[PDB]
Amino acid sequence: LQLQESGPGLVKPSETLSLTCSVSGESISNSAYYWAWIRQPPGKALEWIATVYYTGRTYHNPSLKSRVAISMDTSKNQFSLKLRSVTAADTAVYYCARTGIVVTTPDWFDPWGPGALVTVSAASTKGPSVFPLAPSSKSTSGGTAALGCLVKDYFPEPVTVSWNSGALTSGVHTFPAVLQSSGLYSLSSVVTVPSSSLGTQTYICNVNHKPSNTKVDKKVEPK
Amino acid sequence: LRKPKHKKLKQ
Amino acid sequence: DIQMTQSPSSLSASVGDRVTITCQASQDIRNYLNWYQQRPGKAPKLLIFDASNLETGVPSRFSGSGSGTHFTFTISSLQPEDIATYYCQQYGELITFGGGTNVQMKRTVAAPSVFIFPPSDEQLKSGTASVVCLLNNFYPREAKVQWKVDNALQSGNSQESVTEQDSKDSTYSLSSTLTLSKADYEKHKVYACEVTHQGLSSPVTKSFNRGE
């Protein structure tokens, strides 16, 4: 059983947020489960939005009902969420989830989708530039070498970084993005490797920016 | 009622 | 309508320590109360359902108890992989969550490994130069990173970023980026970051000469 959100990274103020969760491994028409949406503004607590049942029965967060539309599509095994008249307060990560696990009505949420960050802003989407942080004599300590990738000038958040298509996870530090004076974000991802491996092992950072639907695979070579 | 009703479990 | 009062808002403890979190419901909700664990960037994960039942695969150091309005969540021996934010959640009436508790770890002093990165040739071709100074796996979080350009202290042209606590050794990492235009970058020779930290006897400086 896997859930996956899909929606627009950016939504202009006053316009309608629209997301879709696709479910594989279980039928959403199965009378045994419910299907809900939860959101989480950055640095704030989880907030449940609404729950939908195959019959059409719905539960709503009373603070959001007048702006919320939750629907189900039996054909595509998907269910949707629409939030009208968004403001900055609606900028949040939105999760889909399965509920009604034991009770005949919503109880707890398991499992969850990975979550989709929706940013409310009038600015335009911009993909990132990716530049290597090359290992050198100034990037060693004691058999250890540091290298990385600079992911600069993108909007909106987020950007995900992997190393060697996920094969390299030990010693990787991907830093939180910082908002630059230009209104664009920038971050760096680094990894410490043995200096023995610099001449032998290939190092590639895989930068994904789903809001702009762009990727960069940057090979990081020694200086 | 002040002490809650029992929610139904799936059979 | 039913509010969950989660307390404390945040806490710090050392490895092996006992950690306790409480949630109080504004109305009686029987045992219709669950607990979740959420790591940064990750979706929350169910740990305990119906106040006291441990979900499959959850370590037995996590436990919960309570009924009616008073509920308790306990980590009997805090581990570095337990550094996360925890949430209660009732389903007595609709769904509401507690305010959350982010759990941090206190540990021994650890000095950073410092590395400096000159701007790429690719970025220089685009008209901008970013110099990156890296502080790797240190504790505590507090650190002073000072950029010196031709031994002149810099201010207002750098930005810092600190990772979340490492799930293995509970240390922090810090990145500080000095951003100049390509024109201004070529008017100076020596680029240095000087790091001051509790784990270092004296400040550590990593530097390079532009084009050398």
Give the residue extent of every domain in chain A.
2-120, 129-220
Would an 8 Å CB–CB cutoff place B8 in contact with chain C? no
**Tokens representing residue C169 in the block:** 């050794």
DSSP conformational letter for C110: B
Give the whole-angstrom CA distance, residue A167 versus residue A163. Answer: 7
Instruction: Give the containing element (helix H, strand E) for C182.
Output: helix C182-185
Amino acid at position B5, single letter? K
Q: Which among A180, A110, A190 is positioned nearest to C166, based on CA atoms?
A: A190
Beta bridge partners of C207: C192
Q: Is the peptide bond before A211 cis (omega within 30 degrees of 0)?
A: no
C173 φ, ψ to 5°? -130, 145
Quick check: A103 and C33 in contact, CB under 8 A?
A: no
Q: Would the CB atoms of C95 and A114 count as touching at under 8 Å?
A: no
Instruction: Give the containing element (helix H, strand E) for C121.
Output: helix C121-125
| Cβ contacts of C123 on chain A, cutoff 8 Å | 129, 131, 150, 152
For β-strands A10-11 and A116-120, DSSP reports them as parallel
Q: Is the peptide bond before A62 cis (omega within 30 degrees of 0)?
A: no
Q: Which among A139, A202, A206, A151 is positioned nearest to A178, based on CA atoms?
A: A151
Beta bridge partners of A60: A50
CA distance A150 to chain C (A): 9
Helices (H) and strands (E) in chain B, counts: 0, 0
Is the domain C4-105 a CATH 3.30.420.10 member? no
Quick check: A194 and A141 in contact, CB under 8 A?
A: no
Quick check: A153 and A182 in contact, CB under 8 A?
A: yes
Give the whole-angstrom CA distance, residue C148 versus residue A54. Answer: 63
Would an 8 Å CB–CB cutoff place A102 in contact with chain B? yes
For β-strands A58-60 and A68-73, DSSP reports them as unpaired
Beta bridge partners of A215: A208
Residue given tokens 């990492």 in the structure block: C173
Going from the C-alpha of C42 to that of each of A12, A94, C204, the distances in angstroms are 26, 12, 35
A67 φ, ψ to 5°? -115, -5
Quick check: A72 and A58 in contact, CB under 8 A?
A: no
Give the whole-angstrom CA distance, residue A211 versus residue A222. Answer: 31
Give the whole-angstrom CA distance, residue A112 versus residue B4. Answer: 29
CA quadruple C116, C122, C126, C128: dihedral, nearest 10: 0
Q: Is the peptide bond before C8 cis (omega within 30 degrees of 0)?
A: yes
Strands (E), chain C: 4-7, 10-13, 19-25, 33-38, 45-49, 53-54, 62-67, 70-75, 84-90, 96-97, 101-105, 113-117, 128-138, 144-149, 152-153, 158-162, 172-181, 190-196, 204-209
For β-strands C45-49 and C53-54, DSSP reports them as antiparallel
Q: What is the CA radius of gyration of chain C?
A: 23
CA distance A73 to chain C (A): 23
Question: In Å, what resolution does this model reach?
Answer: 2.1
A208 φ, ψ to 5°? -120, 125
Q: Is the peptide bond before C140 cis (omega within 30 degrees of 0)?
A: yes
Count of pairs with CB atoms under 8 A, one residue in A, one in C: 134
Q: Would the CB atoms of A176 and C162 count as touching at under 8 Å?
A: yes
The C-alpha angle with vertex A187 and arms to A203 and C11, in degrees rounded to 5, equals 110
Which CATH entry fits the domain spanning A2-120: 2.10.70.10, 3.40.50.2300, 1.20.120.1200, 2.60.40.10? 2.60.40.10
Amino acid at position A89, single letter? A
CATH of domain A129-220: 2.60.40.10
Q: Would the CB atoms of B2 and C30 count as touching at under 8 Å?
A: no
Quick check: C94 and B7 in contact, CB under 8 A?
A: no
Chain B partners (3+ C-beta pairs within 8 A): A, C
Experimentally, the structure was elucidated by X-ray
Q: Which among A221, A188, A196, A141 is positioned nearest to C114, based on CA atoms?
A: A141
Quick check: C176 and C193 in contact, CB under 8 A?
A: yes
Domain span(s) for CATH 2.60.40.10 in chain C: 4-105, 113-209
Count of pairs with CB atoms under 8 A, one residue in A, one in B: 15
Give the whole-angstrom CA distance, residue A70 versus residue C34. Answer: 24
Give C151-158 contacts, CB < 8 A, sequence gap 24+.
C151/C190, C151/C192, C154/C178
Q: Would the CB atoms of C161 and A101 count as touching at under 8 Å?
A: no
Going from the C-alpha of C94 to that of each of A49, A87, A98, the distances in angstroms are 10, 24, 15
Closest residue in A to B10 (Cα–Cα): A104
CATH of domain C113-209: 2.60.40.10
Q: Which among A192, A187, A189 is positioned nearest to A173, based on CA atoms?
A: A189
